Specification:
Bound molecules: manganese (III) ion
Number of domains: 2
Radius of gyration: 18 Å
Largest sheet: 4 strands, mixed
Family: Belongs to the Bunyavirales RNA polymerase family.
Distance between the termini: 15 Å
Order of helices and strands: HHHEHEEHEH
Subcellular location: Virion; Host cytoplasm
CATH class of the largest domain: Alpha Beta
Number of strands: 4
PDB class: transferase
Protein name: RNA-directed RNA polymerase L
Strand content: 5-15%
Keywords: cap-snatching nuclease Lassa transcription, transferase
Number of helices: 6
Helix content: 40-55%
């Protein structure tokens, strides 16, 4: 039944999530929840974090775990100045700034809407960064699947099914 399923996915997440200090905060934020809404939010957040870490590694970027805005990222490299943007990942090499946006969407309509949003968001930054002699390389890692390197696919499936079941409530 529903209660046994939730306990079981919590156990699976607990056992089989890749031991990674970078997931422990969000892992716990998921495990402590009782209410269906919170279990969605935090479970979906946990999956998104797994994808962000993967996407940064794949693309040679630093994961933005401290939620730094672009403006702050530059201030930290002594560069002086923007639209508020908190990238999923980044790399600054001299005057070349790589920004990474990644996401997951299941339906093509949603995927496109989110792709357009992330694209325009980064394009708007490009013109403003020019004024401080920063070249922007914008990268969008748009995914249709939640599968990732932080959790076995079979665990992933059980988690999303249980989460879909919580949409009942
Ligand atoms: Mn993200
Ligand atoms: Mn750096
Ligand atoms: Mn993003």
């Amino acid at each position: 039944g529903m209660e046994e399923d939730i306990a079981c996915v919590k156990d699976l997440v607990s056992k089989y999530l890749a031991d990674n200090e970078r997931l422990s905060r969000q892992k716990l934020a998921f495990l402590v929840q009782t209410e269906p809404r919170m279990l969605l939010m935090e479970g979906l957040k946990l999956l998104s974090l797994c994808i962000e870490i993967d996407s940064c590694n794949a693309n040679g970027c630093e994961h933005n775990s401290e939620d730094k805005s672009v403006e702050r990222i530059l201030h930290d490299h002594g560069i002086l100045t923007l639209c508020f943007v908190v990238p999923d990942g980044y790399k600054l090499t001299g005057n070349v700034l790589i920004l990474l946006e990644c996401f997951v969407r299941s339906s093509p309509a949603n995927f496109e809407q989110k792709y357009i949003e992330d694209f325009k968001k980064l394009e708007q930054l490009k013109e403003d960064l020019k004024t401080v002699n920063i070249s922007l390389i914008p990268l969008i890692d748009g995914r249709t699947s939640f599968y990732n390197e932080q959790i076995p696919d079979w665990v992933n499936d059980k988690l999303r099914d249980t989460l879909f079941s919580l949409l009942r409530y």
